[PDB]
Amino acid sequence: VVSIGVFDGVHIGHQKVLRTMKEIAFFRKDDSLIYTISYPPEYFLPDFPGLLMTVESRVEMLSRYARTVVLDFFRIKDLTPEGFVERYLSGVSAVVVGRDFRFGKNASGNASFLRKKGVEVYEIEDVVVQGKRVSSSLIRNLVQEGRVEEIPAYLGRYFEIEGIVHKFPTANIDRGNEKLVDLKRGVYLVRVHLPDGKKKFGVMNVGFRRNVKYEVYILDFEGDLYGQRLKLEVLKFMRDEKKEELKAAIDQDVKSARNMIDDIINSK
Amino acid sequence: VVSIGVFDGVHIGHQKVLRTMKEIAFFRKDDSLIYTISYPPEYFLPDFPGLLMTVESRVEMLSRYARTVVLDFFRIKDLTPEGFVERYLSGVSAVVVGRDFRFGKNASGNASFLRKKGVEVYEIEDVVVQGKRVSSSLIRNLVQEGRVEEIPAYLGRYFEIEGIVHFPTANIDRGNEKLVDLKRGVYLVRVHLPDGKKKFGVMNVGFNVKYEVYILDFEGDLYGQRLKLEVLKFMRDEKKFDSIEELKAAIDQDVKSARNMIDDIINSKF
Ligand SMILES: Cc1cc2nc3c(=O)[nH]c(=O)nc-3n(C[C@H](O)[C@H](O)[C@H](O)COP(=O)(O)O)c2cc1C
Ligand SMILES: Cc1cc2nc3c(=O)[nH]c(=O)nc-3n(C[C@H](O)[C@H](O)[C@H](O)COP(=O)(O)O)c2cc1C
Ligand SMILES: Nc1ncnc2c1ncn2[C@@H]1O[C@H](COP(=O)(O)OP(=O)(O)O)[C@@H](O)[C@H]1O
Ligand SMILES: Nc1ncnc2c1ncn2[C@@H]1O[C@H](COP(=O)(O)OP(=O)(O)O)[C@@H](O)[C@H]1O
Ligand SMILES: Nc1ncnc2c1ncn2[C@@H]1O[C@H](COP(=O)(O)O)[C@@H](O)[C@H]1O
Ligand SMILES: Nc1ncnc2c1ncn2[C@@H]1O[C@H](COP(=O)(O)O)[C@@H](O)[C@H]1O
Secondary structure, eight states: OEEEEEEETOHHHHHHHHHHHHHHHHTTOOEEEEEESSSSSSGGGGOOOOBBBBBHHHHHHHHHEEEEEOHHHHTTTOHHHHHHIIIIIIIIEEEEESSSSOOSSSTOHHHHHTTTTTOOEEOOOOOEETTOOOOOOHHHHHHHTTTTGGGGHSSSSEEEEEEEEOOOOOOOOOSSSSOOOOOOSSSEEEEEOOGGGEEEEEEEOOOOOOOEEEEEETTTTOOOOOOOOOEEEEEEEEEOOOOOOHHHHHHHHHOOOOOOOHHHHOOO | EEEEEEEOOOOOOHHHHHHHHHHHHHHHTTOOOEESSSOOGGGGGGTTTOOOOOHHHHHHHHHHHHOEEEEHHHHHHOOHHHHHHHIIITTOOEEETTOOBSSSSGBBBBBHHHHTTTTTTEEOOOSSSSSSSSHHHHHHHHHHHHHHHHHTHHSSSSOOEEEEEEOOEEEOOOOOOEEEEEEEEEEEEEEEEEOOOOOOEEEEOOOOOEEEEEEEEEEOTTOEEEHHHEEEEEEEEEOOOOOHHHHHHHHHHHHHHHHHHHHHHHTTTT
């Protein structure tokens, strides 16, 4: 029994499907297999916002659920429905998908098809947080419009920026090379997970050059992060990206951060 | 600094103007301000093709460049050049526009006037594309011939139909403004759904004019939500079908080419 799809971000509508995968599992005595497609057709277009995380990262969550097998978009973009079943669904007798799920050169095959190929399709009806069908798209935008405080209602958690370092002080994050989405330009209140389990707060600014840069000033930290990797949770969108008195502006933020922080701490 | 004119479509011409503004201003630690004249004289004359987008849409885009302010046409329409200057340009150093920029009753207002009155007018050379001065007027003719493929070249992006929604086909209410109509026929389009998803779809214009799109791989009520539709390719002439089925056939023959062209649009990135 397997659920197919991209699963980018692995949102709440995603987790729905995965769990139902566990159900149809037990009551079938079968084992579970997630089939995560590398990229959506869109990815290969200019106006594509971006992925919410790297595939490597996505197969970290998808994994913590079932056994994930990544399907390469190049390798399957021309396979026909029949071609697909044969090369990827043999032996399997049931899939878990959503009301939309299509597949095969020209979306040639719906669930009906798979049914007529001797396979059971358990369609999970759409999940919707506040009037809209959760989706990577929908989250892909709030990220663009700086609406971070609005993401947990869809992502099941805070949006995250993560990468290798270098390449005030501020740490420069290299989110890798995949075509990832970028946040509205600006200053953000962030939660930093450092090595050794450390979770320090910080402020992160995002600016141009075309390109977008990610720099965080981690509060109360004074060590070397040059080579290290980091995972930052974007909690709040503080202020917009501005204009030699900048060293004076950041303090608005820092002194501000310290305050938003202490806000929670008190509200036991 | 300040820029003036209608700005219907905000095409590459319009952009060179707004970008020059955005610069002439940094060179001065000055501030931008766009004055968009709601309409153009033709708008109220026999046979006006209509605008490309609603004034609201238009302000929307201009907004990303700088503070925008709309001026009723009917108002400044009568003002004399000094009048106009006395009401809007006061204490404003620079004014970015391009050749052929005029203002005031009977167009007596021009760049020389602003200059003689202490304001620095920075004309911009007309932007040519394939031996043509980019113009809101041009683009309109294209839309009208269904030559939507040639549009991005001048317009700087894909022509776009929009409105409120009022196999199944969504009925777009473009609005009550006077907008330009496409050649009646069938088009491949790219839909921008309320939620945020972008599905391909196929639109048909026929006949005022009626616009209805059948979005590919999609199901859900949209009655009441807005849709922006990038018009990507012209496929066929909206013809008469004396038998319902001949239509069902055609419509399906349309959705077929749709699907393939789409495969083309992607197998063309590697
Ligand atoms: C909390 C924080 C807030 C910042 N806010 C801004 C800002 O609003 N505008 C800006 O231009 N730079 C800001 N910066 C700094 C730039 O990111 C900094 O100049 C960096 O070196 C990269 O910018 P650069 O490529 O222009 O040199 C901020 C830095 C920090 C740590
Ligand atoms: C892709 C697509 C192509 C269409 N092509 C035509 C066409 O060539 N001729 C036609 O009369 N109707 C066509 N239709 C249907 C009309 O748009 C339909 O009659 C609709 O109800 C509006 O037309 P009406 O106002 O005359 O009823 C097409 C519909 C779709 C979705
Ligand atoms: N509190 C801190 N926040 C961000 N980086 C720090 C901090 N403390 C030490 N560093 C280190 O210093 C580097 C930033 O160096 P520097 O060149 O001085 O500034 P910039 O951020 O402009 O590149 C980081 O790569 C990191 O290893
Ligand atoms: N894939 C789709 N394409 C077009 N409309 C759809 C689709 N799915 C659902 N709809 C909805 O169906 C309605 C259009 O219904 P229909 O009566 O069949 O078309 P029309 O009256 O324009 O010929 C709209 O409210 C629209 O939001
Ligand atoms: N919001 C949602 N509600 C229900 N099912 C969903 C939702 N979002 C995704 N799915 C299903 O989960 C799988 C997700 O893959 P993808 O759409 O590529 O992210 C597909 O089989 C979808 O139908
Ligand atoms: N193709 C072009 N190249 C350079 N400037 C242009 C072009 N088309 C229009 N402009 C300028 O941009 C402004 C556009 O206003 P309007 O002509 O009303 O749309 C006027 O001040 C024109 O001089």
